[PDB]
């Protein structure tokens, strides 16, 4: 089974950029838009869970609405010469009527819509 195109709109679309210094937390924004007539459930995933704090990391976007997801890069030891293998992904699914975690649990993979972003470190 093939996966369906992403329903949400993403800003940025492909790239999450983090500019140093990395002494303090570096927050970058990921705006998710729901331009549809139905509420859309979303979950944020990443290849480096312990390096970030994502607020919110999941939830529901109302119809015709937009959410600012704060991707927070925790302070670390930056090596300019190392390439950030860090990636993110937004999974989405249509919220069933009159409705959570029980929904995600029984969601088959083609029911999920994926969008991947790559993390870029500068300075």
């Amino acid at each position: 089974m093939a996966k369906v195109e992403q329903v949400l709109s993403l800003e940025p679309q492909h790239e999450l950029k983090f500019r140093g210094p990395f002494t303090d937390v570096v927050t970058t924004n990921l705006k998710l838009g729901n331009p549809t007539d139905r509420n859309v459930c979303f979950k944020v995933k990443t290849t480096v869970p312990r390096r970030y704090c994502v607020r919110p990391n999941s939830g529901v976007i109302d119809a015709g609405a937009s959410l600012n997801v704060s991707v927070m890069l925790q302070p670390f030891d930056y090596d300019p010469n190392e390439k950030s293998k860090h990636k993110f992904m937004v999974q989405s699914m249509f919220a069933p009527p009159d409705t959570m975690e029980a929904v995600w649990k029984e969601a088959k993979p083609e029911d999920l819509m994926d969008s991947k972003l790559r993390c870029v470190f500068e300075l």
Binding site: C53, P56, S58, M89
Partner: peptide, 9 residues
């Protein structure tokens, strides 16, 4: 390959 995990809060 590069497995994705649920992001932490």
């Amino acid at each position: 390959e590069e497995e994705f995990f649920d992001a932490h809060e």
